[PDB]
């Protein structure tokens, strides 16, 4: 046996359960990228003291 | 079940499923990437916008420093 897959059915549940976690991944990814830029400005090393200048 | 069936493999079919998750996030990644980047395009623009007018609005306007006028002062002349 080989090319044929006697499981001709393609259970969408399985795909759904995976696509469902893709929403779970979509959110963690969306955040992680949001972090790749929202954690950049949170400059915690005391940057510009008074207003902007030198 | 013990992690999917046993005779088959469920690995190949699952491999495709996982791709969708990764792809569904890569598609949303792009959309949200512009949401966080576009928030800056405004200041980034307003930034270079001020540096553009400030010059044309200072590289040739030494009348203000004087007071608020120059010519059009027709009156009793002398020297």
């Amino acid at each position: 046996g080989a090319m044929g897959s006697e499981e001709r059915a393609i259970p969408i549940w399985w795909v759904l359960v995976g696509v469902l976690g893709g929403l779970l991944l979509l959110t963690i990814l969306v955040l992680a990228m949001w972090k790749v830029g929202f954690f950049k400005r949170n400059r915690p090393p005391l940057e510009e003291d008074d207003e902007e200048g030198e | 079940g013990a992690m999917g069936s046993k005779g088959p493999d469920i690995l190949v079919v699952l491999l495709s499923v996982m791709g969708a998750i990764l792809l569904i996030g890569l598609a949303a990644l792009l959309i949200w990437k512009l949401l966080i980047t576009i928030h800056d395009r405004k200041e980034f623009a307003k930034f270079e916008e001020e540096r553009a007018r400030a010059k044309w609005d200072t590289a040739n306007n030494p009348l203000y420093k004087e007071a608020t006028s120059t010519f059009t002062n027709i009156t009793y002349r002398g020297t």
Side-chain angles (χ1 to χ4, degrees):
Chain A
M3 193 192 270
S5 75
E6 304 169 82
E7 283 169 322
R8 182 166 65 269
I10 311 187
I12 312 208
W13 210 53
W14 221 236
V15 183
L16 217 82
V17 170
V19 172
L20 203 304
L23 268 294
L24 200 302
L25 181 118
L26 186 148
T27 322
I28 290 166
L29 219 80
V30 147
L31 194 77
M33 51 190 82
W34 213 67
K35 237 61 147 184
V36 162
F38 173 90
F39 228 77
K40 244 168 174 93
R41 296 165 64 173
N42 184 88
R43 277 259 167 80
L46 171 49
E47 37 164 61
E48 315 191 356
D49 286 53
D50 197 13
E51 309 299 87
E52 311 79 61
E54 290 286 304
Chain B
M3 293 179 163
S5 62
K6 284 180 185 291
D9 185 27
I10 198 84
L11 207 308
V12 186
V13 314
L14 183 66
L15 230 171
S16 193
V17 175
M18 274 46 218
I21 282 77
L22 210 186
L23 256 65
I24 290 163
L26 205 83
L29 173 134
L30 206 173
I31 295 170
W32 208 238
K33 282 244 71 78
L34 273 50
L35 208 308
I36 22 148
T37 298
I38 288 174
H39 285 335
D40 307 81
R41 295 278 181 167
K42 270 83 82 91
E43 184 171 277
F44 197 78
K46 246 150 278 151
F47 196 72
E48 204 73 71
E49 193 195 305
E50 287 169 59
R51 288 183 171 280
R53 290 189 77 73
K55 298 271 266 151
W56 205 96
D57 191 82
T58 301
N60 213 246
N61 198 295
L63 53 99
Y64 221 130
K65 191 185 85 175
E66 234 183 79
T68 163
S69 274
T70 300
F71 202 64
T72 182
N73 190 176
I74 295 71
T75 180
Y76 194 67
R77 322 183 156 200
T79 310

